[PDB]
Every structure is written in structure tokens, then in C-alpha cells.
Design a binder for these strands. Sequence first.
DNA 1: CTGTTAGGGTTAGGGTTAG
DNA 2: TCTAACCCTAACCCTAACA
Lengths: 76, 77
Amino acid sequence: RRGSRFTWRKECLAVMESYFNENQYPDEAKREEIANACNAVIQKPGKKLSDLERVTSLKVYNWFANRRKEIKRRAN
Amino acid sequence: GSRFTWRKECLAVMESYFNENQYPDEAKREEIANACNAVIQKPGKKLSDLERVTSLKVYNWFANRRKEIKRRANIEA
DNA sequence: CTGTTAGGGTTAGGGTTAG
DNA sequence: TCTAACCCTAACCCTAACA
Ligand SMILES: [Cl-]
């Protein structure tokens, strides 16, 4: 975990939250869908997405999981 | 004041460890803390809870140090 | 028997607060 | 002002409860 830390861009979070309200438990395929969705919003024309910037299904997973946890905790 | 303040000697000690490893575990942090206290400890005087060094404080400092460094890096870039 | 993952933890980067 | 303590949460580990 000592590597530089990834940041979710405001535009990705929108897609995320959109998909999150619909359903908070995306399956693998769904996560891939959301991943491509997010990438499509951030990729700059004419440039490939760096491996550090590209959203993967796993990032999406962890995001959902973490959010669920934060909510459950923030409900006392 | 009424907030914890790092004594120079303590900082020196901690820095000596920071240059070797920047992520000391609990046990190591105990060692470091005890080292610090030993130095700032005066005879026949119990160190007040505030000025007393603990593994948690060491932890906080190490983290803050790493972060300060990462800032200093971006400043020069 | 093989394979997934919820949700209980922890570690640590980038930033903000509080005294 | 100065910075120790804290906040948030990305990214992982672990085991029970499944399919
Ligand atoms: Cl931290």
C-alpha cells in the first residue's frame, strides 16, 4: 500500500453514484460495464489511458464495498 | 502551551530511525518512544502525560514526516 | 470440491482540522 | 503562525456464508 494513491475524478464519481443508487452490489460484468463507463468519461482525445489512471473492475468493486461500509458506519 | 511539543533531542532520535525505515511497527515504535523518553527524562521527576512520548505520537510523527517530504518533493516540481 | 464475495478487519497517501 | 492529531478512503487481508 506504499505506492502513490489513486484519486477518483469528480466525473467518475458521478457515474459511480448513478450506478450505486440503482444497485449497490454490481456483479463482475456490471463492474466491467461501470469501469468502461468511467474510463470513457476521463480519457483525453488522442491519448491512451495510463495504467495508473484507468479504472478497472476491481477499483470499482473496492469503491462500492468501501462506500457501503462508510454508510453503515455513518448510520451508527 | 497545552499541546504536545517535540523536543529537539527526540526529533533527532526519531530522524535517526526515519532514515533507515519510515514505517516502524508497534514494537519498534515502543523502542523509539522509550529511547526518546530516556533522553528527555530528568532525575527524580515523572514525565507528565502531555510531554511523555508514546508509540502513537511516534506513529503520527512518522506519517506526518513522510507527508511533509512528499510535499517538499512536489514543491520542487 | 472449486470458486465468489460480503463485510469484519488493517495500512497508509493526500489533505484538513484543532489547540 | 505552526504542526500534532485527525479525517477520508483506496487497497488490500481474512473467514464465514454462500452457490
Ligand atoms: Cl495516515
